[PDB]
Design a protein around this ligand. Structure first.
Ligand SMILES: Nc1nc2c(ncn2[C@@H]2O[C@H](COP(=O)(O)OP(=O)(O)O)[C@@H](O)[C@H]2O)c(=O)[nH]1
Lengths: 428, 53
């Protein structure tokens, strides 16, 4: 009825998707073998947003898992939930992407793309009324960035009304993996602004400071970082599956946070994150979810909105709760701080209330917020492109693949007006 | 005089029914306090450190 076709790309995308599907499948009560052994009847009525049918009460996801080397999805199949994925939905090449986006934008990923479009158009036309798609990828890779921006572009030219959404994993600016991550990440952003009209930013160093300083773990891992990418991700689609008092789909999220089609770069967060030994001391009420969700520390981008300006705000609430305390705190954070909120928009916050709490909890909350504090993400990635580029350093990897150097200069310059767009909403 | 005594009796019957409903509404608000309270069980905490990559 309101289906979501889920698209993944890369080593990030195959190991974010493998953990997110561990979250929905126990949210809806699905065992590791496919079938349903839940306890209520609300876990079965709206399951078709993500799952399909089979023989014998077996439900198989509407996912497509895409990569450019066969070794990445050997661990995605050997997982606790590896045998619930349909065997044809995995797409793999043989030669790698090599941390070079044009290898996967023109040569390797441009010949893998036409076998995935034969897959995504098979799982899209089985939807009775598809709401839209969803992508998770890393701009700093070669597969999910070189080819994942090709996969966006061939589904926005064909299906131009349904939603396209992106849980992008942008490069962290302080300490990151790969040296040549500027080129694969800067260049894909200019081909990302046209074709999505909703995009988040999940920086991997903004997941480390939560799982160390707030969750108070000893050895964090990537398995304890995909729990935070996923608990956000089900927390934006939760009224589409569980009935509540004020619903909001994935379409009504955008309507109240993108007022111009170049303004779709938000900053996620997630509120009830407490340490186990420090769980007894916490007070647990409504205004200690709106307390912790709006701290700049909690935020899942590595950029602060004290420097910037909350253009609009959204929030989704789960759990049976009281509309007086939901609606007064949202007013309360907004009235005190005039300098953090724009002029020319009177009310900046949207509210949604689901009923079913997440697994192991009674209440929760999720945040999506538009800012002009995310053009401080883009200037620090466009200072290290043009530092490296005007000395022509790594250039032979890229311009020896059939890619002009005038093609660099447009996404060097015409990307930068999007940066100069956001500072004119520092004015009125 | 008979009708005035009957009227006073009707008002006192109203008072008794209101008293019963007041005790039940106290019960309802005491139950409603324990829904906006949050509490995280051990399932949420066993969600962490399960994948050692
Ligand atoms: N935040 C996060 N980052 C990941 C995860 N898996 C890999 N990465 C990061 O993504 C980068 C590697 O992705 P990569 O393999 O290059 O992407 P691909 O080329 O598209 O397959 C590294 O910088 C890692 O730090 C994950 O589960 N979460």
């Amino acid at each position: 009825m309101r289906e979501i076709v889920h698209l993944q790309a890369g080593q990030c995308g195959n190991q974010i998707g493998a953990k997110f599907w561990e979250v929905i499948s126990d949210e809806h009560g699905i065992d590791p073998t496919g079938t349903y052994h839940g306890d209520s009847d609300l876990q079965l009525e709206r399951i078709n947003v993500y799952y399909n049918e089979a023989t014998g009460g077996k439900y198989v996801p509407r996912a497509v898992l895409v990569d450019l080397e066969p070794g990445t999805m050997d661990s995605v199949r050997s997982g606790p939930f590896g045998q619930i994925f349909r065997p044809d939905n995995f797409v793999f090449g043989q030669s790698g992407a090599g941390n070079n986006w044009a290898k996967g934008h023109y040569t390797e990923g441009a010949e893998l793309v036409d076998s995935v479009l034969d897959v995504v158009r098979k799982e899209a036309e089985s939807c009775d009324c598809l709401q839209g798609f969803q992508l998770t990828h890393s701009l700093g890779g070669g597969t999910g960035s070189g080819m994942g921006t090709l996969l966006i572009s061939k589904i926005r030219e064909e299906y131009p009304d349904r939603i396209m959404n992106t849980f992008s994993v942008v490069p962290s600016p302080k300490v990151s993996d790969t040296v040549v991550e500027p080129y694969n990440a800067t260049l894909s952003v200019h081909q990302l602004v046209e074709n999505t009209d909703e995009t988040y930013c999940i920086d991997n160093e903004a997941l480390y400071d939560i799982c160390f300083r707030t969750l108070k773990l000893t050895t964090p891992t990537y398995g304890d970082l995909n729990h935070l990418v996923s608990a956000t991700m089900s927390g934006v689609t939760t009224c589409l599956r569980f009935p509540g008092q004020l619903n909001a789909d994935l379409r009504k999220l955008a309507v109240n946070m993108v007022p111009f089609p170049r303004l779709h770069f938000f900053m996620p967060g997630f509120a009830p994150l407490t340490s186990r030994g420090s769980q007894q001391y916490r007070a647990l009420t409504v205004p200690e979810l709106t307390q912790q969700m709006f701290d700049a520390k909690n935020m899942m981008a590595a950029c602060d909105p004290r420097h910037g300006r909350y253009l609009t705000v959204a929030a989704v609430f789960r759990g049976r709760m009281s509309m007086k305390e939901v609606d007064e705190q949202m007013l309360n954070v907004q009235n005190k701080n005039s300098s953090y909120f724009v002029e020319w928009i009177p009310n900046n916050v949207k509210t949604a209330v689901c009923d079913i709490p997440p697994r192991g909890l009674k209440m929760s909350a999720t945040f999506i917020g538009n800012s002009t504090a995310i053009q401080e993400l883009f200037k620090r990635i466009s200072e290290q492109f043009t530092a490296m580029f005007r000395r022509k350093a790594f250039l032979h990897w890229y311009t020896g693949e059939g890619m002009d150097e005038m093609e660099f200069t447009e996404a060097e310059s015409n990307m930068n007006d999007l940066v100069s767009e956001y500072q004119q909403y520092q004015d009125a | 005089q008979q009708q005035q005594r009957l009227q006073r009796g009707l008002r006192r019957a109203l008072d008794c029914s209101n008293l019963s409903l007041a005790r039940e509404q106290l019960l309802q608000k005491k139950h409603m306090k324990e829904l906006c309270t949050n509490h995280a069980t051990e399932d949420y905490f066993t969600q962490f450190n399960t994948g050692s990559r």
